[PDB]
Amino acid sequence: GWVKGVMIRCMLNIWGVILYLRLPWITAQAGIVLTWIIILLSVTVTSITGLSISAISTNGKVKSGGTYFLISRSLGPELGGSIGLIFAFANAVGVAMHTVGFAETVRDLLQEYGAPIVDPINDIRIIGVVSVTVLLAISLAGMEWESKAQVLFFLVIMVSFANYLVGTLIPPSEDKASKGFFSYRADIFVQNLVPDWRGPDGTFFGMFSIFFPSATGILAGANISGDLKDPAIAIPKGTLMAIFWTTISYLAISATIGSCVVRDASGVLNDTVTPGWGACEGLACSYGWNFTECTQQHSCHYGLINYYQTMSMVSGFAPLITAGIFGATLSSALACLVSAAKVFQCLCEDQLYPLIGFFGKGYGKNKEPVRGYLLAYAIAVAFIIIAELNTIAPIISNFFLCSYALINFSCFHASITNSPGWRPSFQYYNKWAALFGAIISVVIMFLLTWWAALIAIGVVLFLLLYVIY
Amino acid sequence: GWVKGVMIRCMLNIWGVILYLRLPWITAQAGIVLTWIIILLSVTVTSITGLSISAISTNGKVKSGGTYFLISRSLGPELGGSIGLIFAFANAVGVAMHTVGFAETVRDLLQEYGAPIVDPINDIRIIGVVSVTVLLAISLAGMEWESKAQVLFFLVIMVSFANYLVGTLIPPSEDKASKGFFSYRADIFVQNLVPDWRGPDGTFFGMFSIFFPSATGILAGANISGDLKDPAIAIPKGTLMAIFWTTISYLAISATIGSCVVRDASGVLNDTVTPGWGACEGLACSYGWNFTECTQQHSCHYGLINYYQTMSMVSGFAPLITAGIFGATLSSALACLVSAAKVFQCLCEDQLYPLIGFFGKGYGKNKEPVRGYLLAYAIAVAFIIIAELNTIAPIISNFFLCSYALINFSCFHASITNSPGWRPSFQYYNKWAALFGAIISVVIMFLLTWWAALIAIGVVLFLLLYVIY
Ligand SMILES: CCCCCCCC/C=C/CCCCCCCC(=O)O[C@@H](COC(=O)CCCCCCCCCCCCCCC)COP(=O)([O-])OCC[N+](C)(C)C
Ligand SMILES: CCCCCCCC/C=C/CCCCCCCC(=O)O[C@@H](COC(=O)CCCCCCCCCCCCCCC)COP(=O)([O-])OCC[N+](C)(C)C
Ligand SMILES: CCCCCCCC/C=C\CCCCCCCC(=O)O[C@@H](COC(=O)CCCCCCCCCCCCCCC)COP(=O)([O-])OCC[N+](C)(C)C
Ligand SMILES: CCCCCCCC/C=C\CCCCCCCC(=O)O[C@@H](COC(=O)CCCCCCCCCCCCCCC)COP(=O)([O-])OCC[N+](C)(C)C
Ligand SMILES: CCCCCCCC/C=C\CCCCCCCC(=O)O[C@@H](COC(=O)CCCCCCCCCCCCCCC)COP(=O)([O-])OCC[N+](C)(C)C
Ligand SMILES: CCCCCCCC/C=C\CCCCCCCC(=O)O[C@@H](COC(=O)CCCCCCCCCCCCCCC)COP(=O)([O-])OCC[N+](C)(C)C
Ligand SMILES: CCCCCCCC/C=C\CCCCCCCC(=O)O[C@@H](COC(=O)CCCCCCCCCCCCCCC)COP(=O)([O-])OCC[N+](C)(C)C
Ligand SMILES: CC(C)CCC[C@@H](C)[C@H]1CC[C@H]2[C@@H]3CC=C4C[C@@H](OC(=O)CCC(=O)O)CC[C@]4(C)[C@H]3CC[C@]12C
Ligand SMILES: CC(C)CCC[C@@H](C)[C@H]1CC[C@H]2[C@@H]3CC=C4C[C@@H](OC(=O)CCC(=O)O)CC[C@]4(C)[C@H]3CC[C@]12C
Ligand SMILES: CCCCCCCCCCCCCCCCCCOC[C@@H](O)COP(=O)(O)OCC[N+](C)(C)C
Ligand SMILES: CCCCCCCCCCCCCCCCCCOC[C@@H](O)COP(=O)(O)OCC[N+](C)(C)C
Ligand SMILES: CCCCCCCCCCCCCCCCCCOC[C@@H](O)COP(=O)(O)OCC[N+](C)(C)C
Ligand SMILES: CCCCCCCCCCCCCCCCCCOC[C@@H](O)COP(=O)(O)OCC[N+](C)(C)C
Ligand SMILES: *[C@@H]1O[C@H](CO)[C@@H](O[C@@H]2O[C@H](CO)[C@@H](O)[C@H](O)[C@H]2NC(C)=O)[C@H](O)[C@H]1NC(C)=O
Ligand SMILES: *[C@@H]1O[C@H](CO)[C@@H](O[C@@H]2O[C@H](CO)[C@@H](O)[C@H](O)[C@H]2NC(C)=O)[C@H](O)[C@H]1NC(C)=O
Ligand SMILES: [Cl-]
Ligand SMILES: [Cl-]
Ligand SMILES: [Cl-]
Ligand SMILES: [Cl-]
Ligand code: NA
Ligand code: NA
Ligand code: NA
Ligand code: NA
């Protein structure tokens, strides 16, 4: 069908690490208004790309084809090959991002039980490489039950959302109030409406580059093609509904975490305001909490802007949100891993590039891209060695923005030149909308960082001109 | 011929304002080694572009001449039309830069002799507007004295160079020693071999963006291909010889000004060393001068890094170098203005763009582009309103780097796709050298500043795709 076929597995790929780990932090540094602006600006790009993908899907009656097959048969081989290569690399790095998020969650779990391995960052590296190896092992042999693991992942994420909302509704406990979360309060909402840039990554585009991986994952709907009853109707509805619902979830979580947790807090339970005259400051002082020492000293360990795991603390039952993080990360990383490998294998089936034709060999009876799986695993491990979401996320934002700009401009190019095999039937496709989407995607790509955007653009130009020549 | 027709024409357009006003200051902030590296890196781009230009001039046989005509007939309507518009805009801004340099020289002359008009920056604006109006009046009516003007300008620049080199060897007087000039000394050479990096523009690429317009002007030989004797053998040798000799002049001036003047000095003549047990701190102490007061407070008025007219101070007779600055700036500004107007008119006569076609008609009997002259004058005035050379220069570096990258990549594209017309006979043209030149030009363009490079590439892509579609 369309619901479970497209929208449920597009949500599972869109929801990932930044939903649970960095969205509260983005809402802390930027304002609620600025976080909403970031979310809507990412969703504009992803929705224009979704319209382009819907136009691609409703083009002809292409059967049994992945993302690369659809794009390269509806559009030209010159643009299709570059789109496939950039998309495969972006998914390979997204594997590293989601594995790093899962490893960070496991490392925090280990720390809370007081059993760390070596040290914060190296523990993340070890857990991430072990996780990604287990992910590769599952992807190679044992993916038959991923059709039933999808329901478990979706139900786990739903339970995590419900638990977070229920815990947010609960009035504060002493420990939670000490950690910064009191409750829905107008004063905290007004305080968090305005930006507060507090680090090296504190900037509007610095937070856009970290958030934007939250919006990617719409092309996961494209590679379903061939397992759908009616792609021309299933693909657009599923993709656009998933984009809309994940956008609603991001906005709701941002506006609800910005209205109940203060930016600065100290995990010390003694900071409860002592009776007397006092010189206590801060918004929390009105709720009996004197977090004055850490706020001025800039040595706070908790709060929205300091604690990277505030959704877990706020929720009524912390392990449920940890399970939700595990489900979201292991769904998104697996989807990216088995998307990059399949796109790369299909691309290597087409003798379009000189050196990448070795990775196009299948293994077993399902012709699975074992060589592509190993290359994606190697790239994922290499980017995992970084072991920092705030550094890996800007790379993935750059490469997914490049892929989306490429898709939008390729659709525009096919429309404006009146390509022989480009007669999309999607009602809401406009070539000028696609051009606007590609232009804004490139502008944002250069705005996040200029050198990586230039590298991606140069790679795209090299591939496109090589196929042209 | 090739000497006066081509090489001297390219000489007078390459030699400009940065040679007299900012090269000693670039040598002060970046040191002699990095200034030479900047000069050689700019000359690499300009010589690789000159090889492509020489290949264009030897391709087929064109009798009418003109930069845009040659490039478009040898390379195609799309690439040729993009080049003929970016180059025209770059030449229009070059008029603003050279007029601003002339206005700055006149403002300094007014300050030293007489009284200023309104304000040191507003005086630059007023003098620049008046001088560019006079240049426009000369261009519209009175363009028959050009051979005499070329001879006078070349002779005055030769006299300025000779007088500077003669006064540099002269042992320093009390005033010159106070201002920081101590003839030739190894200690000053060693001290100035290393960077200083003061001010907001202290940067390797910040200095490259200001120096680079000193290397542009290599397209003056191709402008008169029709009016030559044998372009296929005159344009290449003339362009390459002009590039080589101007490179030699820049390297020599940088090396001798680095080894003569200290970075920090005070115009006060009382700053001679007192005969006692003092606390003298600078290198000039060994030469008998005490510049500690301003050097420690960063309030020195003179020196290599503080005085923009130290080249005139060092020389034997300042008025000769003032005349040399006037000649160089006026020759370069006139060449840029007439080249922009003539390229724009020829581009507009070929109906490749919708609205520019209005600036395509000539006036009088020789069909001068009066509308093109007025548009170039308007752009020049708009950029003159910015009365800072260090602000206009990075813009011209960006646009001339874009033009040179476009020419190089257009030649490479015509070579690789085996274009029909494209059959260059130049012995030293290689398509891979052109590709390297285009790539490094784009990389440098983005390294100077990323947003202006992005705007230039966006305009280039817009024009190219408009002609393609
Ligand atoms: C893309 C962005 C930069 C990054 C580039 C990354 C790649 C760089 C490396 C490139 C060299 C690639 C290998 C060449 C050697 C192997 C042969 C081969 O590949 O086939 C062909 C090359 O293949 C191509 O077409 C490459 C095209 C690169 C385009 C780069 C454009 C940069 C524009 C920047 C400015 C844009 C405009 C700016 C305007 C302001 C060559 O075939 P051949 O050998 O000629 O055939 C026989 C002839 N011969 C043997 C006698 C010679
Ligand atoms: C690697 C990942 C990223 C890849 C993509 C990277 C970005 C690539 C972006 C490329 C953008 C290229 C835009 C120009 C070329 C297409 C439009 C055009 O001008 O041709 C058209 C002329 O149209 C006009 O000239 C009138 C003005 C409207 C169109 C141009 C607006 C955008 C201008 C530039 C703005 C962007 C400047 C910066 C970007 C260059 C020809 O067709 P038409 O006559 O319009 O026909 C109308 C048909 N209709 C009647 C059905 C409507
Ligand atoms: C979904 C669309 C995208 C956007 C959605 C964004 C939606 C949310 C956006 C913003 C919510 C944030 C604004 C309200 C918070 C600040 C104001 C406030 O509430 O203050 C009051 C509490 O309010 C309550 O008791 C309940 C409030 C929230 C109920 C649940 C929120 C929706 C949860 C469902 C998830 C969302 C729905 C999804 C459902 C599918 C308390 O005020 P005070 O300061 O204590 O009073 C002062 C008195 N004193 C001074 C005397 C002490
Ligand atoms: C096959 C083709 C491509 C593959 C090539 C791979 C090349 C591999 C090379 C490098 C790969 C690794 C990059 C460096 C990692 C740097 C990390 C870093 O911190 O950088 C820092 C700087 O860094 C730079 O600014 C330099 C950027 C390098 C140029 C990229 C060349 C490739 C373009 C391809 C061709 C294009 C053609 C275009 C066509 C239209 C960021 O710092 P900043 O912000 O500058 O700091 C200023 C601070 N301030 C302002 C506050 C004072
Ligand atoms: C084709 C050209 C290729 C080259 C281009 C670049 C060429 C120019 C490049 C470099 C030349 C300039 C830099 C080196 C010399 C100054 C630095 C120095 O070392 O000071 C020393 C040398 O000083 C002199 O040599 C003075 C006499 C010649 C000065 C230069 C004349 C013009 C050179 C260009 C003419 C035009 C060239 C082009 C014509 C077309 C003096 O120091 P000292 O204190 O006396 O030493 C005492 C040491 N002790 C105290 C320990 C005992
Ligand atoms: C393909 C060819 C056509 C298209 C080309 C691509 C289009 C764009 C082409 C060129 C634009 C490139 C960027 C320009 C702005 C740079 C920033 C700047 O210098 O601001 C200056 C504004 O100076 C003033 O005081 C007001 C006068 C500004 C006149 C120029 C405005 C642009 C108009 C003509 C351009 C459009 C002409 C369009 C013609 C069709 C002030 O300087 P600052 O940086 O703020 O401060 C620096 C420190 N400082 C204070 C000491 C100085
Ligand atoms: C057809 C038309 C196309 C052209 C449209 C014209 C648009 C005209 C819009 C603006 C022109 C006028 C001047 C703009 C700003 C000047 C002021 C300034 O100093 O900016 C500041 C930066 O901020 C930016 O980065 C601006 C970036 C957006 C401009 C590029 C968008 C246009 C791209 C085109 C589309 C391409 C798609 C194609 C790619 C393949 C300078 O800051 P910095 O120092 O440099 O940054 C670091 C500063 N720091 C010191 C704090 C660290
Ligand atoms: C980063 C941001 C600034 C991106 C900017 C995108 C623009 C370059 C695009 C977006 C929508 C485009 C427009 C969409 C619709 C049209 C109408 C079109 O005219 C038609 O022939 C059909 C419509 C009509 O009848 O006018 C001409 C192109 C134009 C103006 C397009 C010009 C280019 C626009 C403004
Ligand atoms: C001093 C340095 C730092 C200046 C900048 C480097 C250039 C001098 C280099 C960089 C890339 C080089 C080019 C890269 C590739 C080629 C292809 C090469 O092709 C051939 O050999 C063609 C003849 C044949 O072998 O059949 C000729 C040299 C050339 C143009 C190179 C010439 C020298 C270039 C421009
Ligand atoms: C906050 C910073 C960003 C602010 C943007 C605000 C929020 C945007 C969130 C994204 C929504 C953007 C979606 C894309 C909108 C532009 C895209 C608009 O949709 C394209 C339109 O073409 C669709 O309509 P058609 O082209 O066919 O014409 C209509 C067909 N009917 C109606 C005749 C049947
Ligand atoms: C703030 C915490 C974030 C939580 C806020 C946002 C809520 C998260 C977003 C989740 C929104 C919900 C997504 C789930 C899908 C909603 C959107 C549903 O999509 C359309 C359905 O009608 C299709 O479903 P079915 O054909 O299965 O019919 C269902 C009815 N029967 C068949 C079972 C009887
Ligand atoms: C100080 C560092 C300097 C860096 C600058 C280097 C600058 C560029 C190289 C410089 C000097 C050039 C040396 C001499 C001038 C070129 C001299 C070589 O060119 C002779 C030209 O007339 C024509 O080239 P050809 O003679 O090979 O053939 C012409 C075309 N037809 C007849 C076959 C059709
Ligand atoms: C096949 C193509 C492959 C790539 C080819 C070449 C790649 C090598 C290029 C990298 C060399 C550059 C290394 C970067 C050096 C350190 C890079 C340090 O970054 C500084 C520059 O990005 C910016 O300089 P500015 O911002 O000062 O310029 C003027 C703007 N202001 C003054 C107004 C602020
Ligand atoms: C709340 O706690 C803060 C912690 O800084 C108190 O601030 C300090 O108070 C003591 C005096 O009793 C001294 O350390 C200084 O007066 C303050 N130092 C700093 C670092 O601010 C504050 O007095 C407390 N206010 C109450 C009682 O609510
Ligand atoms: C070189 O100049 C410095 C700076 O003026 C002199 O050092 C100062 O000497 C006078 C008188 O002793 C006082 O202003 C201070 O004691 C010194 N420092 C400053 C910052 O002024 C130094 O004496 C001079 N050396 C000479 C003339 O040989
Ligand atoms: Cl995510
Ligand atoms: Cl995606
Ligand atoms: Cl110059
Ligand atoms: Cl030039
Ligand atoms: Na995602
Ligand atoms: Na997920
Ligand atoms: Na010049
Ligand atoms: Na000149």
Residue numbers in the entry:
A (entry chain B), B (entry chain A): 137 to 605
Publication excerpt:
The sodium-chloride cotransporter NCC mediates the coupled import of sodium and chloride across the plasma membrane, playing vital roles in kidney extracellular fluid volume and blood pressure control. NCC, encoded by the SLC12A3 gene, is expressed in the distal convoluted tubule in the kidney, responsible for sodium reabsorption and playing a pivotal role in extracellular fluid volume and blood pressure control. The first branch is Na+-dependent cotransporters, composed of two Na+-K+-Cl− cotransporters, NKCC1 and NKCC2, and one Na+-Cl− cotransporter, NCC, responsible for ion import. Thiazide-sensitive NCC has been treated as the drug target for hypertension by the first-line clinic drugs, thiazide diuretics.
The high resolution of NCC-TMD EM map enabled accurate atomic model building for the TMD and extracellular domain (ECD). The TMD subunit adopts a LeuT-fold conformation, characterized by inverted repeats within TM1 to TM5 and TM6 to TM10 via a pseudo-twofold symmetry axis parallel to the membrane. On the basis of the structures of NKCC1 and KCCs, the high resolution of NCC-TMD leads us to unambiguously accommodate two Na+ and two Cl− in our structure. One Na+ and one Cl−, assigned as Na1 and Cl1, are located in the substrate pocket formed by the antiparallel broken helices of TM1 and TM6, corresponding to the conserved binding sites of K+ and Cl1 in NKCC1 and KCCs. Cl1 is mainly coordinated by the main-chain amide group of Gly152, Val153, and Ile154 from the discontinuous break of TM1. Sandwiched by both the negative ends of dipole helices of TM1a and TM6a, Na1 is well accommodated by main-chain carbonyl groups from Asn149, Ile150, Pro349, and Thr352. In NCC, Na2 is coordinated by hydroxyl groups of Ser467 and Ser468 from TM8, and main-chain carbonyl groups of Ala464, Trp151, and Leu148.
